[PDB]
Amino acid sequence: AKKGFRAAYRFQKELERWRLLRCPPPPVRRSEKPNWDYHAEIQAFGHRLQETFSLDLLKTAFVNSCYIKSEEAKRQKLGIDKEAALLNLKDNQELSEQGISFSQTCLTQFFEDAFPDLPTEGVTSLVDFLTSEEVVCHVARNLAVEQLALSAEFPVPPPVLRQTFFAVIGALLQSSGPERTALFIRDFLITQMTGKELFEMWTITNPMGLLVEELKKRKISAPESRLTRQSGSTTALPVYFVGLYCDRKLIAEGPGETVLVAEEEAARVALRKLFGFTENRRPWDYSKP
Amino acid sequence: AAPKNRRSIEVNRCRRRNPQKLIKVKNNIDVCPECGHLKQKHILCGYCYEKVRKETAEIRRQMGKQEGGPFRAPTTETVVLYSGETPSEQDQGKRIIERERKRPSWFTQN
Amino acid sequence: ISHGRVFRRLGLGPESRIHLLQNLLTGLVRHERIEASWARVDELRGYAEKLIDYGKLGDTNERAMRMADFWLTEKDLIPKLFQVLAPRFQGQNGGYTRMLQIPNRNEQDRAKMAVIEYKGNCLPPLPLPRRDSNLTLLNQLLQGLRQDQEASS
Amino acid sequence: TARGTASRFLTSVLHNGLGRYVQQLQRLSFSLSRDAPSSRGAREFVEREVTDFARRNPGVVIYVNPRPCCVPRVVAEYLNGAVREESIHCKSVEEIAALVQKLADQSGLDVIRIRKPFHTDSPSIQGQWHPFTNKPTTLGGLRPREVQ
Amino acid sequence: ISRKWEKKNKIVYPPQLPGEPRRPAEIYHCRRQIKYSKDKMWYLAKLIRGMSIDQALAQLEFSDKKGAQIIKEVLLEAQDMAVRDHNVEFRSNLYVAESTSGRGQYLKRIRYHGRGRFGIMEKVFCHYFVKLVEGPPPPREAPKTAVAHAREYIQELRNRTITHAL
Amino acid sequence: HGKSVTWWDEHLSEENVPFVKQLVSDENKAQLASKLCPLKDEPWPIHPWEPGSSRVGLIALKLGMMPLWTKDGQKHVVTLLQVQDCHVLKYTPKENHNGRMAALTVGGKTVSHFHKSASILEFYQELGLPPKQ
Amino acid sequence: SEKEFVEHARKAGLVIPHERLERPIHLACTAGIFDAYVPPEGDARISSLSKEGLAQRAERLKKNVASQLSIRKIRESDPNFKIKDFPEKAKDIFIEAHLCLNNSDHDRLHTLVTENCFPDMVWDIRYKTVRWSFVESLEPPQVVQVRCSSLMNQGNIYGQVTVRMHTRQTLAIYDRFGRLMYGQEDVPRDVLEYVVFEKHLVDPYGSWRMHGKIIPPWAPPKQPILKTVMIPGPQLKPWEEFEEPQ
Amino acid sequence: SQLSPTELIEMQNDLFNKEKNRQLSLTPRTEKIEVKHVGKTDPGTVFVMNKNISTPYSCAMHLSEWYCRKSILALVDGQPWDMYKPLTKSCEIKFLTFKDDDPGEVNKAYWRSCAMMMGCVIERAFKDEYVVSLVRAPEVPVIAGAFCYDVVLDKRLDEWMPTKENLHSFTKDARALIYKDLPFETLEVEAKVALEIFQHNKYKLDFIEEKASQNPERIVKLHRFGDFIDVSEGPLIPRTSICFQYEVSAVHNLQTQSSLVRRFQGLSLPVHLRAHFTIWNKLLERSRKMVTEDK
Ligand SMILES: [Mg+2]
Ligand SMILES: [Mg+2]
Ligand SMILES: [Mg+2]
Ligand SMILES: [Mg+2]
Ligand SMILES: [Zn+2]
């Protein structure tokens, strides 16, 4: 035995740490943790984005169906009278619909203006991507939407989150004009398109066919695959560069292991030049008109 | 000659977990058609051989009782019998051992 | 370099080897079935086989008699060799002895063990290994071949 | 040491400052003692500075708890989900001020080795070198000893 | 001393919601303070890892090691525990998940030498641990095919990056 | 799968063992007596002797030793080598082996079928000889 | 160099220190059930008939000498005691006891059930999970008989009340791995049980407890187990031959 | 009827599944039957089992893995039972092995099973353009040097007999079939719903008709493994894995007045009995000759 409190206490902390390392505790709502004031949080959410919301509208936005049904479970199981004040809650359904519709419209217009040559199927693909489960959930989670959202099941399953994000968008669209909201969308959505490719989000499976069609439209005829560069054919690691020629002018060119893969690549490149989705392309404009 | 340094645990694990020091798996094990215990294919079954050993012991005991001493062993062939049996004409003129147990299934009359 | 050495070294020396086999043989002629160290039994088997051959030479042969006198230690057995064992081997030239490997000794020395026996003894029979029957699938397939060696001749 | 610890590439949370700048510090929680001497500085800070600080940074919520503790802490919490603990124990008003400022300007990313000072998507405008970029093409595209 | 392995059998799980996969039984069992060495025992314990329990019993049956019969007794006890106490149909349906040897508490004795010197000798003890799981034995891993190696090599070549480059 | 070890004898009955043995040995006699007549079959072209040429060899069996005498009176000791069953087995052409000389492969005395390996048994199967030691 | 192990644990029953006990063992209960009521063999077909069952039960209660002798001993030793109220209390005791087995709360279970019963209902089930619900009582609980054991040593009397009850219960037993073992959770299965209750009288704290559970000799075979089971043949040493009865 | 090769498979399998689920629904509960062990080995052992669920295999699983691997066929009372065929009533069980003294039952079972395998191999080894009609698996004794399957082929195909290449292809495919380990599944059916499964093969329908004709209740014995279904006499071995050496030896054209029928002959041995290379070659030589017993 050694006489003192200090080392004992300090060790109790270690015991706790190991206890948490060996069994991790299931994630808990930030709402159910020691420092919370819902109101102040909302106001902060507003101010930090440099936006102005109606507090009624935003408070409305972070409400979900499931939260209300769970609240009705707690209501009906204890025999309490809630219904008047509880069904006055006005969930986010409406706002979320306005928000998604508007965002899709807005984005679509953005792209349609930036890339005149993108076929409709393509711009549709892009908007589909920036409105995706993944991307929106990511963004919302990092803007502390998951924090404010009222729901059952704390990890907040992704569909509910998407709902909530666009809910907030709609709330903003009511609170300020389509102009301001357009700015918000181009700041927190369009930026997720940074560093991304085209065919990263488009997913089209036969580049050659699509190129032939898009060249019919342009009244150019028959891309001819022609082998340009090659190193080692007999190797386990060959390299081919396939060029695509139109009337003996070279439109585009690409690398690969196999002559097939390379040809396919040159197709993708040509496509990327035609649609004006390119590396060299003008970076997006972030400015105040 | 005394070791110049302590052999580290990595070296040591390399030596004693080596394939050549591991017990090698025996592939010749099978089941005795008789008692359904286990045996190696080239060896008599232990269980069955225990049956035989016990019975042999009892027989020898009872044929030690027929011999009054150490040095008396018969000058004739011997034959062992069981409850409800009688010596054959071919088997008479022989030493006879009579056991109480009924003749065992594996043991034939011959 | 052991090349072409037929006899294995046992006991305290060559003489102790002979006496070990002496005892083993006497045990074998008395009880007609014994069990011992696989190596020693193997070593014994040859002697056990030749003893019957000296027995066949008959009581009156002097060589066979003092041979049996040396090898069979308990003297009372010497008649048994000549008047019991040697008669019941008549037709057969060499078939006198059955030797099988028993499971390893249960004592902590875990030796390799064998049981050795004079054929035609009166004891519960050893559970010898049986060949498969003829009704077994493979053997049947061979029966086919056999009958077609008969049909084609 | 560098081989000893983790590391990360230089990044921002949510492409901050691209479209618009979003202060990443979300909330700030102080815990101090009205009575204990160790918290003395922290108390002064709560009197004079906190108020003003809160106006300078409208987007961060600031919770202050007087409770009976021996070691005053400030818990920063970021949009990133990151939580950073700090001890304001036995410091001036000035030192706490400086500290809280550091907390206000941080990304909330993990502070560890950063592999390289820059981060670029599309470094490559106008091409990226490959073994053929500077090589002349020949007529017919023949190999060195190839005949036609 | 520390006895933990024994308490592993006393865990109770929450009942299974229908539609979820049926959870395989786990039986922890051990024997403490055996007069075998720890290492000698390790070989035996290693031998029977991942074998179906009948296979393990077969292999042990013919080993000449002193430890072999100990482990065999432990396995039989574990089998009967598995069928009786926990609920397992098909006592042949168990395989050996974990098998290992720990060291026990040693006795210390004198070992005499000569010229009046002595060494200090340890009468050695050990523990044997086993954990049986209900099911067929998990399949033994085949070594990498040429195809697999080549894949991995290519993938590695493909993971390369321009270094210190920007 | 734990597949157990097996030998040729294992599953045969007491009836079939003599049979199998007869089968193999008889086919051995047939096969050896069949190739007994080389020159009437399809012999490869015989060439005359060139100066730098080298013959095939044999595989024999060392029997023992014997004395033998020479007309000058001296005594020599000799080794008896018996050729038992000797056949050429395969032929590797000049360019495929040393780049200098062709390689003939020659077999020694006959052995049991049962104790060789599947590969080897196939090799002799397509030949029509019994296996060489 | 000389040190030995300790702690070889042993349980030695010896009568001498067992007799020298200075404070002899105080029992709250008696291990047996004195007189086992043996029910009608047609008790299944009289249960669908209301005024057959009720009539014959009440009749057999009022007609018996021993029954009302004991009911008199209990009434005289313990005032404010009624036979017509009791099957209610008994039923409630039942429901709470098994609802204790659900939650695995042994403290309350020691208030409800007797010392003879507790080992039985708790023992085997402790490493398993039990879900047991009460849905219906088809025939209202009947009081079959009453008995008293007079111990002349202690002057102690134990009232033992046999209540026959017909019931609708749902029982599911889960294995320690959480996998279902005995029976479904959705089937309201019909049960008939003869439940013996006991109370210590001379005791001032006088609890009414659940003593035992009697099963009739004709009782319907209990529902089948889920898993398959094997019953080994006699284990034989080598020299012992097998013998088959017919 | 216009149907793809895959559609036939789908139909038959879905019918089989329907029937099997019907037989399953017929048994309302978990019912306990008491099986006794009449074996020479572990006497007096008594299994307590689920009626129409538990199988003699599942019965061996209570004993030891040794029975599971060694036991090909299960004698229930006096009759051979397939290892995976669910027990019906309470009874007594004995297990049957290849190296057993009077294996003949087991032998028959093995021969049948291999035959069926070959049937499956053949049916799916021909181009979609042609039409392959499996006929039956004529039951030969095993002293006859092979096992065999009868198949009729498309009329434009009547001229050619296979080449060592082709036979070796069949064999390769059968080994492919063995490699993946498929249990043999059994079902007892009524003729009405048996005929609906086969349909397009006439000879099959005839066979079913005769087979159901000799049984009072019109019961037909179905076996299936993987996607393949067939009718057969008597029980089969439990696994595909049991076969080791397997060969499709040769085919022989045999013609009736009303049809031209190809007889596919092959030869095989189980892992337990596997024979040395030389022995194998001799037996394989005998398996090339025509094997005739239809009666
Ligand atoms: Mg020595
Ligand atoms: Mg001294
Ligand atoms: Mg030391
Ligand atoms: Mg030491
Ligand atoms: Zn045996």
**Best interface-test mutation with F: which of C128, C130, C132 has the largest number of F CBs within 10 A?**
C132
Same domain, A54 and A170: yes
Q: Is residue B22 part of a domain?
A: no
Q: Is B35 annotated as a binding residue?
A: yes
In chain C, residues with a C-beta closer than 8 Å to the C-beta of E66 are 108
CA–CA gap between residue F64 and residue E5 (Å, rounded): 71
CA–CA gap between residue A236 and residue H256 (Å, rounded): 58
CA–CA gap between residue G109 and residue G125 (Å, rounded): 14
D116 interfaces chain E, CB cutoff of 8 Å: yes
Q: How many A from CA of B52 to the centre of ligand 1?
A: 32
Specify whether the CB–CB gap between A250 and A224 falls below 8 A.
no
In chain A, residues with a C-beta closer than 8 Å to the C-beta of E157 are 237
Question: Which residue type does C108 have?
Answer: Q
Q: Which of A155, A174, A205 is the last residue of a domain?
A: A205
Q: How many A from CA of B40 to the centre of ligand 5?
A: 11
Q: How many A from CA of A53 to the centre of ligand 1?
A: 102
CA–CA gap between residue C82 and residue C84 (Å, rounded): 6
Residue A173 CB partners (closer than 8 Å, separation 6+):
A98, A99, A102, A181
Q: Which of A173, A205, A237 is the last residue of a domain?
A: A205
In chain F, residues with a C-beta closer than 8 Å to the C-beta of C136 are 11, 13
Method: cryo-EM
Q: Is residue A2 part of a domain?
A: no
Specify whether the CB–CB gap between G39 and G216 falls below 8 A.
yes
Beta strand E126-134 pairing with H228-231: unpaired
E166 interfaces chain D, CB cutoff of 8 Å: yes
Same domain, A177 and A233: no
E87 vs G1, G131, G181: nearest CB: G181
Same domain, A227 and A192: no
Q: How many A from CA of E117 to the centre of ligand 2?
A: 9
Same domain, A249 and A266: yes
Specify whether the CB–CB gap between H55 and H86 falls below 8 A.
yes
H185-190: strand order across its sheet: H185-190, H219-225, H228-231
Q: How many A from CA of A145 to the centre of ligand 2?
A: 87
CB contact under 8 A, G4 and E107: yes
Q: Whose CA is closest to B72, among C117, C34, C24, C30?
A: C30
Q: Could you give the number of structural domains in chain A?
A: 2
Resolution in A: 3.2
Domains of chain C as residue ranges with CATH: 10-121 (3.90.1030.10)
Count of CA atoms in the C-beta half-sphere (13 A) of H263: 21
Q: Is residue B2 part of a domain?
A: no
**Residue whose entry in the numeric block shows the structure tokens 């890339």:** A115
CB contact under 8 A, A237 and E150: no
CA–CA gap between residue A266 and residue A243 (Å, rounded): 6
**How many CB atoms neighbour CB E118 within 10 A?**
11
Residues forming a β-bridge with F78? F66
Count of CA atoms in the C-beta half-sphere (13 A) of G13: 0
C-alpha F50: how far from its chain's center? Answer: 28
Torsion of CA F44, F50, F54, F55, to 10 degrees: 40
**What CATH number belongs to E1-166?**
3.90.470.10
Question: If residue H23 lies in a helix (H) or strand (E), which one and from where to where?
Answer: helix H5-26
* CB neighbour burial string for G109-137, b if at least 16 within 10 angstroms, e if fewer: bbebbbebbbeebbeeeeebbbebeeeee
Q: How many A from CA of E108 to the centre of ligand 4?
A: 10
Q: Which of A161, A177, A205 is the last residue of a domain?
A: A205
Specify whether the CB–CB gap between G163 and G174 falls below 8 A.
no
Residue C94 CB partners (closer than 8 Å, separation 6+):
C49
| Backbone dihedral angles phi then psi of residue G213, each to the nearest 5 degrees | -130, 115
Question: If residue G189 lies in a helix (H) or strand (E), which one and from where to where?
Answer: strand G189-200
Identify the three-state secondary structure at position E42: helix
Q: How many A from CA of C11 to the centre of ligand 1?
A: 6
> What does the block give as tokens for B73?
């062993």
Q: Is B45 annotated as a binding residue?
A: yes
Residue G110 CB partners (closer than 8 Å, separation 6+):
G118
**At CB < 8 Å, which residues of chain F contact H?**
1, 3, 6-8, 11, 20, 23-24, 113-114, 118, 121, 125
Binding-site residues from annotation of E: 122
Question: How far from H148 is each of A236, C102, H164, CA to CA, in Å?
Answer: 47, 46, 18
CA–CA gap between residue A256 and residue D58 (Å, rounded): 54
Q: How many A from CA of H67 to the centre of ligand 1?
A: 44
Specify whether the CB–CB gap between D28 and D135 falls below 8 A.
no
Q: How far is D66 from chain A (nearest CA, A)?
A: 13
CB contact under 8 A, B49 and C127: yes
Count of CA atoms in the C-beta half-sphere (13 A) of B53: 14
Question: Which residue type does B29 have?
Answer: I
Q: Do chains G and H touch (3 or more CB pairs under 8 A)?
A: yes
E157 interfaces chain G, CB cutoff of 8 Å: no
> What does the block give as tokens for H236?
């089969």
**Best interface-test mutation with B: which of C123, C131, C132 has the largest number of B CBs within 10 A?**
C123
Q: Which domain holds residue A254?
A: 206-280
Query: Chains that contact D by 3+ CB pairs under 8 Å?
Result: A, E
Axis crossing angle, helix C62-71 with helix C14-31, rounded to the nearest 10: 100
* DSSP string for residues in G113-161: B-TTTHHHHHHTTTTSEEEEEEEEEEEEEEEEEEEEEEETTTTEEEEEE
Q: How far is C153 from chain H (nearest CA, A)?
A: 16
Please name the residues between 100 and 159 in chain E that touch chain A, using a CB distance below 8 Å. Answer: 150, 154, 157
Query: Chains that contact A by 3+ CB pairs under 8 Å?
Result: D, E
CB contact under 8 A, H31 and G244: no
Q: Which of left, alpha, beta for D63 (phi over 0: left; psi -120 to 50: alpha)?
A: beta
Residues forming a β-bridge with G193? G165
Q: Is residue B45 part of a domain?
A: yes
Specify whether the CB–CB gap between H262 and H253 falls below 8 A.
yes
Q: Do chains B and C touch (3 or more CB pairs under 8 A)?
A: yes
> How wide is the angle at C-alpha G146 spanned by C-alphas G142 and G147, nearest 5°?
155
In chain D, the largest separation of any two C-alpha atoms, in whole Å, equals: 97
Q: Could you give the number of structural domains in chain B?
A: 1
G129 interfaces chain E, CB cutoff of 8 Å: yes
Domains of chain D as residue ranges with CATH: 1-148 (3.40.30.10)
CB contact under 8 A, H70 and B35: no
* DSSP string for residues in A125-172: HHHHHHTSHHHHHHHHHHTTHHHH---SSTT--HHHHHHHHHHHHHHH
Beta strand D25-32 pairing with D61-66: parallel
Beta strand B95-98 pairing with B78-81: parallel
Q: Do chains F and G touch (3 or more CB pairs under 8 A)?
A: no
Same domain, A79 and A166: yes
Same domain, A50 and A170: yes
Sign of CA dihedral G60, G62, G65, G67: positive
- Alpha helix positions (H), H27-64: 56-60
Q: Is residue B10 part of a domain?
A: no
Please name the residues between 100 and 159 in chain E that touch chain H, using a CB distance below 8 Å. Answer: none
Q: Is C132 annotated as a binding residue?
A: no
Q: Is residue A183 part of a domain?
A: yes
**Best interface-test mutation with E: which of G179, G180, G186, G231 has the largest number of E CBs within 10 A?**
G179
Q: Do chains F and A touch (3 or more CB pairs under 8 A)?
A: no
Q: How many A from CA of H232 to the centre of ligand 2?
A: 88
Q: Which domain holds residue B44?
A: 27-110
Identify the three-state secondary structure at position F117: coil
